[PDB]
Symmetry: C3
Subunit: 456 residues, 3 copies
């Protein structure tokens, strides 16, 4: 058969699996081997967004699951353990496996059990693996997917960096950024109406202090999966071009494209050469996913400017919003303090500072100064101080028509921002009230809930 | 012009059209011909799912419509009849036709009439045809699509089997698996929110006893259409790889891929070589389509195991759910008995037996034994027998926390299953009650409707 | 670097930008230049459909924005002005730019300001540009996208015509064809549930008297963008085939395909050779977009028939519906008259005449004659005249079962048409009542609103 290089030789190899966004070393081998893969399913609560918990079902404790790297022609002895704390049974289907279910019917594993099966890796390429346990959609939606690379016999060309990025669509009972432990929502999942669309299992998984890194002149290979369960990614890099895009083990290689479609369950290898420094954004260019549901990752390039190629500046909160900053840990802290009943004004101020970036600063500026006669100030604002309840109604329901702020007329339009949750409005307004010589005090989530329930 | 090999020669040929999933023989001809195609539109009720009727609008009595096979350079004299029982007018647009509407304006046909037009098949490839009558979306949604193959002059390479598979999205007033004659739902169609996503016009059209067949070592070509009207298919084969994928008459051929995107209105030729026995699942890998809306088809391969390639087992209800079994004819029978007012306990038991597979057996086992201390038993269950109403509430609304069943503690989570219809819950629980030394009796759809309307 | 042909030579060039659907001339240059691009953002109300206003945000006063044409290796000095009448700040991200944000962070521009940045056009291809100002999705949804062509050094092959077509998804508070000034709807946008899907910013932007034109034997190149923000286009030409399809600056060229997937944010160059006369329809083959949300454009080919290739007729209202006619200006006029409180019967009759095409004429004929015993007449209809309120209920809610019209029995089905707005039903029925020896009078939108609120 194609990809059959005879029986395993050398010694059995225990596969080294890596957590996203890292990749195991190149196999660097000229002979087929028996490769033993041990992967454990863990069900666990993790933060899908700041102050938002979700019960993920994982291969190896992460979303996506542990990266597996083997060579075409290898005999793979696959061990699937299900942690005793699990409530559900699980299995695995690996794309690129030649056999019914890609392993599913020989990997069915109850909590506290282990299964094994063996396959020959006949098909070179990058492949999605996922759980295949009824109801399959629920298992994939909860995070049960990852990538397996089957290298060609001669290996992939050498690059400076290899990274592991996987998109998924997620379905919570609550709205986007609604705090608390969020249940899986079967109705949204069947309707293909996700609340979150993420790289690597969380908002901000690959932004700020968790960005991917390279230097000017270096090559970067990214193994890009789409776990779905339902969405097709218009996968794109802002401000750069892919030297190459190869899907699964396909013979076709596209070169010099910026935007590529990755099917649900699909995988691609992309290659990038870093030319000028700054932040390069990976997005799903179905744009509300990227900028309203979490589908943004950063590759930060360090090194010398080249003004002959690009004269301009690094991104900030205008483009990246509240993900320009290293993290939003203050939001997590304020949500934990609300639960404990120890929420301070300063907890709200720091959370609001984080959330004000982009969301409000695009028009009002990072210092609240606005732009005289165009965008009114929030700094030392008489209009704000005069009526904090009115300010709650402005954030939720918008504002238009002639107003006077700090002695100047404005005649413009502030769009409604109803998608902000009650805690987010409360924290942003508490931040503004405690900044820039404003009168202090605080707005509570309960205050905003009342205004939302009866607009002015 | 390209594809013009001069005037028709030989004798006029009456085209032999085939019903899905079969394909007409290769044209096996070295000269261009006059090919006469006769296709009749029939509007008729058929079962879209067990006990679920739908008024399909068809080309030739099937969804997809009759397969048409001609040679590049042929002169095609196309006759479209509209059966006198039809209520709507119809026409045809064939992709690959050079001319306005692909035939639409010269094929407009009232009930009881016939139209004809002639075209030269200049463009080799596989092409969708469909109705193009206002409102076009409603006509396509009701089933009016099929494939035309225009062979290259030398013919396609020989294979062991050729099959015809076409995806469609469907829009019923009722929910998925809600029984009765279901009207078309224009609102769901405009919103692109299908209730069913199917291969060949019905749930189970290509599963169980209707699976496609081949043997180890054989080649299979599948002509794959996407009628839409609205969805793009992440078309995938579980447990295998496509040797080749060619779209329409494109010059590009992708080789060695498992997952491919087929546009709405698009068509592809895929080729598969059978290597090891078992069930190979064709799916839309937008996974809730495949596992919650009907988008699964089976190619069953018979022949010798090859343990060096794959050591594992054939699929069962864990992966295929209630489509692992040859058919679900008991569901059809119980739905007909409910309508007639002759529904017996045994009718409910056999329907429930069919629906229990995967849906319940993944956790509770096919024999209801569960797994001591992990998944509680439904076999001889004291907890079930103690309160059948509570069991209805468990299926609809789920269960969590500590319980005692047959003297053993469980402390786990059963997800809600609200997407099951009242008749499905009633039949599954009647099956369980009449199995495994349980106390018998019955649950009615009306019993479940009351519990659904007021949870415990 | 690739695409670097040294410093600019010759004289600085002021780029000539074109409004859709036209393209600037080929650069026709053998040396790299300094190209100065001046583009102004304008926020303005325009008609998205007849009698439906929308506040678009534009690059250069149009949707899509002004077409930019440069040569690979050019140094581009990009000037972005924001008109003083603007309420929002804006910026630009050009795909194909090597640098963070594709220009976004160096083009941020308040109302009444100007920004500039310089880049080297290293990457040949066709590229989307768009606004990248928080909230990015809202800016793109309001129309802020266009195309930039970076020619290869030797230029593109010569063709007879070059056109500029760009798809977008739009999100109004009101339903499709609901009259008035329609606000942007953030909720529909986040849910990816557009009310309109358009080429070039309006229904009918490229139909009727605004169709694209060519002659038999000519070559046509179309630069096709997908601004999104959210949808992927199953981009298709009815009745023809693309000689070539190239995405962005990709090395891959597909040849001889009819249906291609364009990602959100993607762009392609397609080439068509005109073979036989008539209307060739560009659509998103996610068919409810094309036939229920506005996603249809026409290339009209003039010249000699070739009966050996295609024996049939030009399209009419069966396929193109109310877009077969040169325009629907009567709908705009009646909507303006309703607002002014000067709506005449004749205003309603002319609007209804426009809306009757396809919507009603597919079954009842353009002259209201129907087809004896199959489709009842609206011409001199006793049944219509007997009860105009019943006729309102028939349009909204459908009709089935045995009726008698003009002495003949019908036993058929007219589907409900609830998606028609109150003014559309009122105008269509006023047209019918004032035609074909019917009794005249008028139906008002308020009459239809009452019937819709309580069906018979
Ligand atoms: C531009 C798109 C804006 C964004 C984003 C936000 N605001 Fe705004 N705001 C904007 C305008 C043009 C106006 C004036 C409207 C008019 O009728 O002319 C406002 C007004 C306010 C006000 C009241 C006036 C003042 O005190 O300066 C407040 C309190 C306010 N805006 C707050 C605010 C916050 C907290 C934001 C993020 C959540 C925010 N705005 C975003 C323009 C824009
Ligand atoms: C795993 C994902 C399950 C599926 C699918 C179904 N059930 Fe279940 N069930 C499951 C658990 C873990 C439990 C115990 C929950 C706890 O609090 O620990 C249950 C419980 C029941 C019961 C009650 C107890 C008993 O009699 O054993 C019933 C009656 C029951 N389940 C029925 C049932 C049916 C009919 C199913 C398909 C429709 C079904 N379950 C699916 C786990 C899982
Ligand atoms: C075919 C798909 C139709 C379209 C589109 C429209 N109508 Fe219709 N109409 C149709 C049928 C088959 C029937 C008879 C139904 C039956 O029970 O047999 C009708 C009936 C009417 C009537 C009443 C009878 C008459 O006066 O002829 C009216 C007033 C009517 N239809 C109007 C009408 C209008 C205004 C339409 C566009 C908005 C329209 N119809 C579309 C079939 C079809
Ligand atoms: O390339 N911008 O999302
Ligand atoms: O390949 N699994 O759906
Ligand atoms: O090709 N028809 O939409
Ligand atoms: Cu699982
Ligand atoms: Cu899969
Ligand atoms: Cu039809
Ligand atoms: Cu079509
Ligand atoms: Cu903008
Ligand atoms: Cu972009």
């Amino acid at each position: 058969l194609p990809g059959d290089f005879g029986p395993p030789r050398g010694e059995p190899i225990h596969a080294v699996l890596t957590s996203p966004p890292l990749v195991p070393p190149p196999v660097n081998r000229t002979y087929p081997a028996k490769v033993i893969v041990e992967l454990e399913v863990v069900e666990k609560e993790m933060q899908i967004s700041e102050g938002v918990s979700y019960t993920f079902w994982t291969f190896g404790g992460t979303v996506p699951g542990s990266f597996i790297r083997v060579r075409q022609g290898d005999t793979v002895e696959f061990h699937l353990k299900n942690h005793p704390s699990s409530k559900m049974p699980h299995n695995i289907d690996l794309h690129g496996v030649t056999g019914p279910g890609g392993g599913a019917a020989s990997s069915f594993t109850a909590p506290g059990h282990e299964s094994q099966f063996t396959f020959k890796a006949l098909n070179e390429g990058i492949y999605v693996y996922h759980c295949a346990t009824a109801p399959v959609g629920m298992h994939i939606a909860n995070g049960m997917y990852g990538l397996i690379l089957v290298e060609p016999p001669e290996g992939l060309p050498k690059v400076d960096h290899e990274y592991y990025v996987m998109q998924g669509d997620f379905y919570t009972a609550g709205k986007y950024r609604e705090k608390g432990l969020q249940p899986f929502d079967m109705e949204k999942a069947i309707d293909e109406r996700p609340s979150y669309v993420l790289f690597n299992g969380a908002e901000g998984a690959l932004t700020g202090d968790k960005a991917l890194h390279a230097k000017v002149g270096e090559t970067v290979r990214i193994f890009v999966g789409n776990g779905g369960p339902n969405l097709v990614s218009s996968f794109h890099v802002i401000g750069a071009i892919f030297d190459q895009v190869r899907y699964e083990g396909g013979t076709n290689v596209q070169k010099n494209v910026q935007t590529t479609l990755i099917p649900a369950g699909g995988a691609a290898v992309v290659k990038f050469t870093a030319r000028v420094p700054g932040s390069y954004v990976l997005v799903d260019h179905s744009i509300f996913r990227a900028f309203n549901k979490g589908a943004m990752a950063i590759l930060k390039i360090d090194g010398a400017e080249n003004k002959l190629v690009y004269s301009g500046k690094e991104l900030d909160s205008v483009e990246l919003g509240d993900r320009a900053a290293p993290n939003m840990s203050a939001v997590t802290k304020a949500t934990q303090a609300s639960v404990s009943g120890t929420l301070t004004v300063q907890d709200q101020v720091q959370a609001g500072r984080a959330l004000f970036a982009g969301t409000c600063s695009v028009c009002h500026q990072g210092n609240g100064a606005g732009l005289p006669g165009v965008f009114p100030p929030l700094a030392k604002s008489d209009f704000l101080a005069a009526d904090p309840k009115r300010a709650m109604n402005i954030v939720l329901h918008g504002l238009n028509g002639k107003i006077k702020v700090n002695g100047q007329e404005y005649d413009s339009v502030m769009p409604p921002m109803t998608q902000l949750n009650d805690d987010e409005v409360a924290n942003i307004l508490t931040y503004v009230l405690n900044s820039w010589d404003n009168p202090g005090g605080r707005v509570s989530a309960e205050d905003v809930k009342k205004v939302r329930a009866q607009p002015a």
